[PDB]
């Protein structure tokens, strides 16, 4: 099965900066020029969140500061400018091939004063 | 808005099995196969198998082949799940999320999950 690998595990970021989650891809996950990459996000106590489907779909109600690129085994997940509500852990999953899987999680964490 | 209503938290003895569900509403049921994910302790996610409503069809993690069991029941749009054998291991939070394949390919709506205790 294809697996997927999130580098880094833990990531801090300044208030307003860029923050770049990258998800590597055992196998191609291209099928007619669309990437079956998928982005969530969970906060603790909560089930997980969809923020972008097919690498690059804003899902409705997502804040525009997320943006997702990519295709074929390497994609990335940023969020730019980075705010306080974006604390939270970030997973990609890809439904090219069965299983489906996702991969092991970024958690994100904000640097203030 | 789509809600996913699962069943309450389960305290089971080890080589038992518990047998979860998870309502659907507001959307036709069977025009969406239902997913299920293991979010262990403390840790990633992990998907079990996925289950086509409308005929039944299922298919599964291997990792999770014999443990658990995809039902569904169109009359009362209900999607259950049974876990057998359970162990030490099998405690945790356990989600059943809809994914739309003729839709756009995403697993849209998540339940709020259901804490099962092993001990």
């Known amino acids: 099965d294809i697996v997927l690998t999130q580098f880094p595990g833990s990531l801090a970021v300044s208030l307003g900066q860029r923050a770049t989650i990258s998800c590597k891809a055992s196998?191609?996950?291209?099928?007619?020029?669309?990437?079956?990459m998928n982005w969530y996000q969970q906060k603790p106590g909560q089930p997980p969140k969809l923020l972008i489907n097919?690498?690059?779909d804003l899902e409705s109600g997502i804040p525009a500061r997320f943006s997702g690129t990519g295709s074929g085994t390497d994609f990335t997940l940023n969020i730019h400018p980075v705010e306080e509500e974006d604390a939270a852990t970030y997973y990609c999953?890809?439904?090219?091939?069965?299983?489906?899987?996702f991969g092991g999680g970024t958690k994100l964490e904000i640097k203030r004063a | 808005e789509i809600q996913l209503q699962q069943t309450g938290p389960e305290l089971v003895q080890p080589g038992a099995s518990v047998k979860i569900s998870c309502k659907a509403s507001?959307?036709?049921?069977?025009?969406?196969?239902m997913v299920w994910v293991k979010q262990s302790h403390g840790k990633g996610l992990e998907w079990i198998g996925n289950?086509?409503?409308?005929?039944?069809?299922?298919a599964y993690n291997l990792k999770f082949k014999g443990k658990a069991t995809l039902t569904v029941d169109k009359s009362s749009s209900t999607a259950f799940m049974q876990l057998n054998s359970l162990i030490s291991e099998d405690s945790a939070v356990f989600y059943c999320?809809?994914?739309?394949?003729?839709?756009?390919?995403?697993?849209?709506?998540w339940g709020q999950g259901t804490s099962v205790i092993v001990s």
């Open positions: 999320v809809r994914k739309g394949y003729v839709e756009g390919g995403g697993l849209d709506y």
């Open positions: 196998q191609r996950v291209d099928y007619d020029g669309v990437s079956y």
């Open positions: 289950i086509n409503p409308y005929h039944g069809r299922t």
């Open positions: 999953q890809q439904s090219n091939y069965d299983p489906w899987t």
């Open positions: 507001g959307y036709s049921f069977t025009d969406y196969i």
């Open positions: 097919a690498a690059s």
